[PDB]
Structures are given as C-alpha cells and as structure tokens.
Amino acid sequence: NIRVYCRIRPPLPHEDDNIEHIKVQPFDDDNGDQGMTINRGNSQVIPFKFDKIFDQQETNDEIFKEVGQLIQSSLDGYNVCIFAYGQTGSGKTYTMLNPGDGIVPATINHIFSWIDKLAARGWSYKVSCEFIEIYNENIVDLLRKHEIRHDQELKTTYITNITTCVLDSRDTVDKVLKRASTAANEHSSRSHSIFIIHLEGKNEGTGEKSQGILNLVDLAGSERLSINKSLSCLGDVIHALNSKRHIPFRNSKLTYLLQYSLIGSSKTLMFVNISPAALHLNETINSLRFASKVNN
C-alpha cells in the first residue's frame, strides 16, 4: 500500500499572499480521492488527484489524525515509511519535525499511548531510535565510518557505528527532541533526514513476538541545482513497487538503506509539500507531477 497526501503551507510574511492559481476540490467520497487544479496562467489548467489534500488552514495536529492509523501498523509487525517531498521552503521540516506537532514527535507520542495500553495484555515493548542525515551519499549521525549491512535471512538493516538511543521514558524522549546557521541550513536542505524507530515487543504470557520499523524521512529539496539522482531513484523504486519485476534498490543509498521497509507488506505514505506562492508555480508543478507517477 502506497498513499500520497498533498499539503499546501500558508503564505510567509515576506511573500505575496495571492493563491488564486491553486484550487482544491472537495474530497470525492465514492472514489476515495481529492482533486486540485493549477491555473498555469495563459489559462492552461492542470488537474491532479491525490488520496487527500490539506489546505493552508490545516494544522500539524489535524494532519496527525489522518496518519495515526498508519503508525499503529508497526504494532502488527508492519514496516512503515513516511516521506516528505517538495522544494526547499515548502514545509518539509515543519511537517516532520515541528516541536510537539510534527510527524516525528507526534509518532513517538502516539506509540507510547499504545505501549501503555498493551501492557495491560502483558505485552512489553522496547523502543529505540536512530537519527541520521544523508548528503552526497555520506551518512552522518545526528545523535553523536558508517556502512550499511543487510541481513538477507532476517530481512533487517544495520548501519555501523550509529548511536542507537533507547527511548526509556517520556523524559528521555523530550531530551533527545529538545536537543534537535546559514551554512547549516543550506546543508540540511540538500540532505535527507531519516529518523528510524525500532519497535520490539514480547509477550511472555502468550509467547508472541513483534517487530516494527517506522522510517520518518525528510527528503532533500526537489528543485534542480546526486540529490537529483537519489530522488529519481526513489521515484522509480516506489512506482515499480506500485505496478513481480526487478527493483534496483542498490541504485542509490537512500533506497538501499530503506529497502526492507519498502518491499512486501510494507506501508508507505508520501507528503508532497507545496508552496502557495506565484514565483514558485513551476517547482510546484514538478512536485505534483512527481507525486502523481509515484501514486499512479
């Protein structure tokens, strides 16, 4: 299962708040989809359809209501990927990492709720995480040679010398996230940011085990400037997973790292973040056309 949401951020103060060129239709019930058009100027109107479209008023909290169900998969042993795609400036970091509100803090919080509750059935759970950044195919550890190693048999993935932080408490979580320059911003906007949560549960009373990975990914900006190569290769991978045939995971680090959370029963959701601004009509269109191939 692969789902695609689109999110339009509100206009910024230093920009022009004219959003006449984007129009979003109501959620089509009997076809499970939401449409939008973009008026390109010269009256050439381009249609798009996604699984859900979030307008400028929609908040991080509202957005999590429509993601929560996917997160709950990792308790049934599914692997999960949530990607944020779109141009630098469109709100990827804000969507994934906004304090308290973003997909990452919200996900972590949501998972604890379920852990608290499942303890009543004798499930006990270990939660650990890793937080990495990939730039020009170099892995940097944001909790500090880093090599990827897969275990064919157990279908698991390891990155060498990465600090894995054990999430023991809501206090322990809060420290890690509270912890999370001009050059630095340019740098991270050309990088993927991956937050990996591992969920391990055992239930002595039944004997049952469970594992779940959640990969919360904040991608390199999609505008044209290697970053280009890994975005295309992600596109090709996901589309081909949607269509039994051969998938070149190894063609880029990002897809090679995430391969076991993209094959099989794995569930994926992509956020296409778009800017509402006039100057960015073209980059918005590329983002939408990309999101369509990934979805269609």
Ligand X SMILES: Nc1ncnc2c1ncn2[C@@H]1O[C@H](COP(=O)(O)OP(=O)(O)O)[C@@H](O)[C@H]1O
93 sits near Mg ion (criterion: CB under 5 A): yes
- Between 59 and 169, whose beta carbon lies closer to ligand X? 59
Bridge partner list, 49? 35
- Between 188 and 268, whose beta carbon lies closer to ligand X? 188
Q: Residues comprising the binding site?
A: 86-94
CA angle 217, 219, 224 (to 5 degrees): 170
For residues 164 and 161, what is the distance between their CA atoms, to the nearest angstrom?
9
- Between 92 and 267, whose beta carbon lies closer to Mg ion? 92
Selected from 83, 91, 220, 231, the binder of ligand X by CB under 6 A is 91
How many CA atoms lie less than 13 Å away from 39 in the CB half-sphere? 11
For residues 51 and 234, what is the distance between their CA atoms, to the nearest angstrom?
19
Q: Which stretch binds ligand X (CB under 6 A): 84-92, 124-132, 192-200, 222-230?
A: 84-92
Q: Residues comprising the binding site for ATP?
A: 86-93
189 sits near ligand X (criterion: CB under 6 A): yes
286 sits near ligand X (criterion: CB under 6 A): no
Instruction: Count CB-CB contacts under 10 A for residue 43.
Output: 6
292 sits near Mg ion (criterion: CB under 5 A): no
Element (H, E) at 231: helix 227-242
Selected from 35, 68, 89, 235, the binder of ligand X by CB under 6 A is 89
User: Which residue is associated with the tokens 């996901």?
Assistant: 238
CB of 28 vs ligand X, minimal distance in Å: 24
Q: Which of the choices Mg ion, ligand X, none does residue 89 contact, using the CB cut-off of 5 to 8 A by kind?
A: ligand X
Evaluate whether 290 touches 274 at the Cβ level (below 8 Å). Answer: no
For residues 94 and 106, what is the distance between their CA atoms, to the nearest angstrom?
12
Q: Residues binding Mg ion: what is the number (CB under 5 A)? A: 2
CB of 91 vs ligand X, minimal distance in Å: 3
Question: Which segments of 182-259 does DSSP mark as H helices, in order?
Answer: 182-189, 227-242, 253-258
User: Which residue is associated with the tokens 């359809």?
Assistant: 49
By beta carbon distance, the residue nearest Mg ion is 93
Q: Which stretch binds ligand X (CB under 6 A): 90-98, 121-129, 152-160, 244-252?
A: 90-98
Selected from 1, 10, 113, 138, the binder of ligand X by CB under 6 A is 10
Q: Are strands 124-135 and 192-202 parallel, antiparallel or unpaired?
A: antiparallel
Report the interface residues with Mg ion, using CB under 5 A: 92-93
